[PDB]
Amino acid sequence: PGIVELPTLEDLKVQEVKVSSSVLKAAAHHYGAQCDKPNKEFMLCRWEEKDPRRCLEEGKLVNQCALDFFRQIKRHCAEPFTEYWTCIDYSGLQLFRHCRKQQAKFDECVLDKLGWVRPDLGELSKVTKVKTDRPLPENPYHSRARPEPNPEAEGDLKPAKHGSRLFFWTM
Template sequence: MVITDKVELPTFEELEMQEVDLSTATLMAAAPHLGLRCEEVNNEFMLCRQETGDPRACLPLGKEVTSCTLTFFRHLKATCRDEFAQYANCIDKSSGDFSLSQCRNTQAVLDKCILDKMCVQRPDFGYFTRARVHETQRPRVEGEEGCCVEGAVPRLPDDAPRPRARFNSRYHYMTE
């Protein structure tokens, strides 16, 4: 990405935060419970990113998301370490593409442990794909959506004429 000297970048002190340095299998094993536990903070961060179009404006919220994740994994380690390690190891070793189908028994054991000790129930299938309204306390960003570049081509109005493609579609050539 090319930037000009007028763009102010955050300092290293503003960016400094402990990383969540975990493996893919570990993150996949905890993903549903982590997503549920940190949903509010993550939605706030994503709303900020969407409204401002500038990741620099959302650094504090990004730190909150990372902090929530670290807190969740510390609590998980303290309460269900063995069950979680067994499930993550199953995901890692059972297939080459991190398939979960071979690990349903260890998943059930982990889900029970997390429900009993952390009071977090595994969300049902499709929970994260449902549309939900997120209520925020942040003031709404005024102006056009996203980041605008000087001299950018303006969007077409919704009622603009949309003629058919001049030389047909590509699909016609792909089916022959």
């Protein structure tokens, strides 16, 4: 019994970034490097509040920053990125292994056109510290008041009054 509150359709009307999974995979490392702040803030909100109905604005801002990143890569390094993501898309598993020359062209293009460097191995998987300004959810699980603990057992022990007190056994 209650209300399943749901934000109206207007709040979740994001611009809906539209690139295929192969295109996303091609720009994975550079996007993670130069877009880490919105992703990290949004995910910390998601993990702390534990309520996607609450951190929708961070979901907006992450999409805004992703679209800005893709607009920059469109404006500066369109051709190498296009060839690289097409060559990634050809593979069934989308492995970076086969596509290394196009990766080199894309990397040098973004390095000398947008000042970017790909993260080294394992750099993109380190736990980061975010400087979010939202408060800490006091009751993320919405837990009710806990039952009071049972009365604690304490006190000095003396011999049982009149022994066992079990039938004729006096002692």
